[PDB]
Amino acid sequence: SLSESLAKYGITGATNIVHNPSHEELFAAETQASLEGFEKGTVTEMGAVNVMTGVYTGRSPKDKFIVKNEASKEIWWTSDEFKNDNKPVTEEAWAQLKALAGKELSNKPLYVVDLFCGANENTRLKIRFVMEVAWQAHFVTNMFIRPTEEELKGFEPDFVVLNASKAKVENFKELGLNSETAVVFNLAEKMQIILNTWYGGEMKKGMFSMMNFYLPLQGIAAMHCSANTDLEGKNTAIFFGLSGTGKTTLSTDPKRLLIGDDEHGWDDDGVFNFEGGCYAKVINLSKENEPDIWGAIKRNALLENVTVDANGKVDFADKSVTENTRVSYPIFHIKNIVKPVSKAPAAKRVIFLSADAFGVLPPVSILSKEQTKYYFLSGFTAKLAGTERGITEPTPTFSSCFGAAFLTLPPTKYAEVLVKRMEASGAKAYLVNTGWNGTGKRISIKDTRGIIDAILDGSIDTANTATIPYFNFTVPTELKGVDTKILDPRNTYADASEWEVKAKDLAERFQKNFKKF
Ligand SMILES: Nc1ncnc2c1ncn2[C@@H]1O[C@H](COP(=O)(O)OP(=O)(O)OP(=O)(O)O)[C@@H](O)[C@H]1O
Ligand SMILES: [Mg+2]
Ligand SMILES: [Mn+2]
């Protein structure tokens, strides 16, 4: 049965098959002393197992490709006019890549995990993961929605994901690839192959990209955002933001119930999470500053690339190798969460998080209808903390919809459905700088949380306002529980002219960039 299914994926001769392993079975497997290299798992003092993934400490967008065929006719392909990560490959290259992954996973012990991507049955995807490494199976078990034993019976996948990280593409040049690493998608065969990259995120972001294709085509918005509700479970709020800009951090609120922190859909019913866990950043983590994440880090959680010594002591501050240290864990490792299903009513507040490394954007701007669409499409922010391989220092960028690297349809399609939903729920939008200002340092988290509070409780709705030049941003002149001085981007500069010259330049950059739409 299962072996016959694997055969169709090109995998044969399996010596043992573990189907949806439990957490305890995963722990024992991960802690076996004979595990070599990137497969080795170390038990930390936190009680959770930690693994290292070498140089693959972030996504590999340059190695992401989509097979060009009838099934991917609607893919938002890359072009000189509008460059993106959707690079095309041929069926001929695919057969060879697939065969490569198949051979790698053949004749050996394998893990097969059947999961759900999407909290709603009417739009979810059934994913079957196949891998030879125990912690990899643990990673998907934490990040995806876990089906009951009944639902596993007769489980028929909609998408197959073959993780063949141990294999590499040496002849990538002749196959039209970019390097020995490869993350390819075939919508005809509905399969994802992972070759030569051990980064955990490749296992969740691939299907996220697929959900970003099917959902919008059904009028359902697919969003790179975190989302929570009040303690009553109403007044849903969503936080859009590029990798490492604040979604997880700011959605973490004691006065809120967490829906999800990274991937969400917005249908007729409301906002729902695609995942069953959180893949949080842990750099500089401390029990005092991040109680929840810290408490979530225990057995069954999986630390990734954190510094651990002999005694199993962890140094969450070491970023020498990477500042994109992570940890995945079932969402139920967090106390304040929406249940029994990660879904809630339509959002009332939509927040666009932007890490402006230019120090031009004010801490918070109250956006108009036109501005809401405009800044959502522009997605101005910055690639940071090694979320993508190669990016070390803050790099200004225009990532459409604050998640361009995961967009499989034109950004306008995402904006279209988002506005549609916002209009129906009467949601208001805001642009929040989680980046830098005149001080050359990032805006204080204390003030940012204070701004988030004013947005969620309506305080900002009646706050005194002023207009910021060039962008014509409407900003509050003051807010309770917020440092007044920072509200105006100009106040942290010795000479206002410094900000002006930068604001003027940034403004036209927007103008030129928006032309590609
Ligand atoms: N004002 C601020 N607001 C939010 N985060 C801030 C701020 N200043 C600094 N930070 C830091 O920026 C980082 C944001 O990380 P977070 O995990 O929230 O990113 P994310 O949007 O969830 O990324 P991903 O989608 O990659 O998971 C944290 O390390 C946080 O401490
Ligand atoms: Mg996050
Ligand atoms: Mn993300």
Side-chain angles (χ1 to χ4, degrees), residues 66-82 84-102 104-152 154-155 157-172 174-180:
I66 300 176
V67 185
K68 173 130 182 186
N69 49 34
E70 184 57 23
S72 60
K73 57 188 173 301
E74 296 297 338
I75 284 291
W76 177 44
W77 301 108
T78 185
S79 67
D80 297 311
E81 20 279 87
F82 207 151
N84 57 55
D85 295 331
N86 300 141
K87 301 174 292 299
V89 284
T90 59
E91 293 276 13
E92 183 171 357
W94 169 262
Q96 295 175 75
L97 294 168
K98 179 186 182 184
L100 212 196
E104 176 61 45
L105 298 173
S106 284
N107 311 303
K108 62 178 58 169
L110 293 173
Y111 293 91
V112 179
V113 203
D114 294 336
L115 303 153
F116 296 134
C117 175
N120 286 162
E121 182 180 62
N122 59 2
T123 60
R124 68 186 186 187
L125 286 165
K126 290 179 285 182
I127 319 298
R128 168 161 287 164
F129 278 94
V130 184
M131 58 271 285
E132 60 184 300
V133 187
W135 66 257
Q136 280 172 171
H138 181 13
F139 182 96
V140 296
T141 296
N142 283 170
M143 304 306 303
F144 282 89
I145 297 177
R146 298 151 293 273
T148 62
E149 180 52 57
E150 319 89 61
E151 306 176 305
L152 279 175
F155 185 104
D158 291 303
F159 234 98
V160 176
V161 182
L162 307 182
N163 185 320
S165 52
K166 288 189 190 182
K168 56 185 179 183
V169 196
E170 297 180 349
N171 66 326
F172 69 86
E174 63 174 355
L175 293 183
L177 296 183
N178 162 261
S179 71
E180 291 183 345

Side-chain angles (χ1 to χ4, degrees), residues 14-39 41-82 84-102 104-152 154-155 157-172 174-291:
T15 56
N16 189 269
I17 294 175
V18 179
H19 194 210
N20 280 67
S22 69
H23 278 302
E24 46 273 71
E25 150 140 42
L26 281 170
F27 175 70
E30 293 170 342
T31 55
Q32 288 303 299
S34 55
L35 292 183
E36 307 285 53
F38 301 157
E39 295 181 53
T42 310
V43 180
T44 69
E45 69 194 309
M46 298 279 261
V49 171
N50 171 255
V51 297
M52 304 298 301
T53 63
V55 297
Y56 309 96
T57 51
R59 292 182 285 99
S60 301
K62 300 185 182 303
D63 302 308
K64 177 181 167 174
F65 302 81
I66 300 176
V67 185
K68 173 130 182 186
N69 49 34
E70 184 57 23
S72 60
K73 57 188 173 301
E74 296 297 338
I75 284 291
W76 177 44
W77 301 108
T78 185
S79 67
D80 297 311
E81 20 279 87
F82 207 151
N84 57 55
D85 295 331
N86 300 141
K87 301 174 292 299
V89 284
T90 59
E91 293 276 13
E92 183 171 357
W94 169 262
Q96 295 175 75
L97 294 168
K98 179 186 182 184
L100 212 196
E104 176 61 45
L105 298 173
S106 284
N107 311 303
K108 62 178 58 169
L110 293 173
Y111 293 91
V112 179
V113 203
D114 294 336
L115 303 153
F116 296 134
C117 175
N120 286 162
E121 182 180 62
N122 59 2
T123 60
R124 68 186 186 187
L125 286 165
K126 290 179 285 182
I127 319 298
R128 168 161 287 164
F129 278 94
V130 184
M131 58 271 285
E132 60 184 300
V133 187
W135 66 257
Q136 280 172 171
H138 181 13
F139 182 96
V140 296
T141 296
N142 283 170
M143 304 306 303
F144 282 89
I145 297 177
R146 298 151 293 273
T148 62
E149 180 52 57
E150 319 89 61
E151 306 176 305
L152 279 175
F155 185 104
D158 291 303
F159 234 98
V160 176
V161 182
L162 307 182
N163 185 320
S165 52
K166 288 189 190 182
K168 56 185 179 183
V169 196
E170 297 180 349
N171 66 326
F172 69 86
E174 63 174 355
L175 293 183
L177 296 183
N178 162 261
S179 71
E180 291 183 345
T181 293
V183 188
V184 195
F185 295 90
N186 191 322
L187 274 68
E189 297 176 27
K190 298 171 186 173
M191 180 182 287
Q192 176 189 182
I193 47 182
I194 294 172
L195 292 164
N196 194 51
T197 174
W198 302 71
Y199 184 60
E202 298 298 341
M203 284 183 286
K204 46 159 283 160
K205 292 294 192 180
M207 298 301 92
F208 178 44
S209 289
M210 298 300 94
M211 301 285 277
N212 288 340
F213 182 70
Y214 303 110
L215 271 61
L217 295 179
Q218 298 170 69
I220 297 173
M223 323 175 292
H224 184 214
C225 70
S226 58
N228 59 204
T229 67
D230 53 50
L231 306 188
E232 312 291 69
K234 309 188 298 169
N235 297 147
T236 297
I238 57 179
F239 307 77
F240 274 103
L242 223 200
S243 313
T245 62
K247 302 190 299 307
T248 295
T249 296
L250 300 176
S251 53
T252 295
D253 193 314
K255 331 174 217 67
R256 299 244 117 192
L257 251 39
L258 201 281
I259 299 162
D261 72 334
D262 189 70
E263 303 172 10
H264 298 82
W266 192 341
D267 63 16
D268 285 350
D269 189 290
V271 179
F272 60 95
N273 188 178
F274 290 173
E275 334 184 77
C278 308
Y279 184 49
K281 276 163 54 57
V282 302
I283 186 69
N284 297 309
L285 194 74
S286 81
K287 178 171 191 297
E288 211 68 48
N289 293 320
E290 301 77 41

